[PDB]
C-alpha cells in the first residue's frame, strides 16, 4: 500500500502505491511541485505520470 | 554527528549537527532553498538561521 522512494541526497519519502513523480515533487514541498518541469528516476528522464517504485532515486527538475 | 528532523508531511531528513533551517531548505531541494523567505518550526515562526533539533517539524515558507 506504500512505496519508499529516495531523494538524491539519500532521504526517504513515502507515498501510497500508485503515486507519480508529480506526487513525489509535491511531497517534497509545494514549491517543488509548482515549479516542476520534469523528473529523472535513477538518472533517466521519465514521463510526468511515471508511477514510482520503492528504491528508486527521484531527481525533480525545476523551472530554475 | 548529525540531527534528524521532520517534514510537514511526515518524512524524515538528516542533516549534520548545527544545520539551520536554511540548510534544511536546500537539503530538501534546491528550489525550496532558492525561493525561501521564512521558516516555521513545530508550527511557530522562527528566525531563518535557527539551529534545528532532532524531532522538530520544519515548514519552509517560499516566495508566494
Going by C-alpha positions, the residue among A41, A47, A9 that lies closest to residue B32 is A9
Number of domains in chain A: 1
User: What are B3's strand-pairing partners?
Assistant: B15
- B64–chain A Cβ distance below 8 A for any pair: no
Shortest Cα–Cα distance, A23 to chain B (Å): 12
Contact B29 A62 (CB under 8 A): yes
Residue in B10, B11, B32 nearest the CB of A32: B32
State the resolution, in angstroms: 2.2
Q: Give the chain A residue whose CA is nearest to the CA of B25.
A: A29
What is the C-alpha separation between A38 and A36, in angstroms, rounded? 6
Helix (H) or strand (E) holding A32: helix A30-34
Distance from CA of B43 to the nearest CA of A (A): 16
CA–CA gap between residue B45 and residue B58 (Å, rounded)? 10
Task: Give the bridge partners for A59, in sequence order.
Answer: A40
Between the CA of residue A25 and those of A37, A45, B16, B31, what are the distances in Å?
A: 10, 14, 24, 11
Q: Position of cell 528550489?
A: B31
Q: What is the span of the domain harbouring residue B56?
A: 1-64
Distances (CA, A) of A21 to A25, A61, B10: 6, 11, 18
Phi, psi of A8, rounded to the nearest 5 degrees: -55, -25
Sign of CA dihedral B29, B35, B41, B43: negative
3-state SS, residue A27: helix
Look up residue A29 and give its three cell numbers: 514541498
Chain A residues touching B30 at Cβ < 8 A: 62, 64
What CATH number should be reported for the domain holding residue A6?
3.10.20.30
A15 torsion bin: left (phi>0), alpha (psi -120 to 50), beta (else) = beta
Amino acid at each position: 500500500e506504500e512505496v519508499f522512494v529516495f531523494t538524491p541526497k539519500g532521504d526517504v519519502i513515502s507515498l501510497p502505491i500508485g503515486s507519480t513523480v508529480i506526487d513525489f515533487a509535491y511531497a517534497i514541498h509545494s514549491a517543488v511541485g509548482n515549479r516542476m518541469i520534469g523528473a529523472k528516476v535513477d538518472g533517466r528522464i521519465v514521463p510526468i505520470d511515471y508511477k514510482v517504485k520503492t528504491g528508486e532515486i527521484i531527481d525533480v527538475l525545476t523551472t530554475k
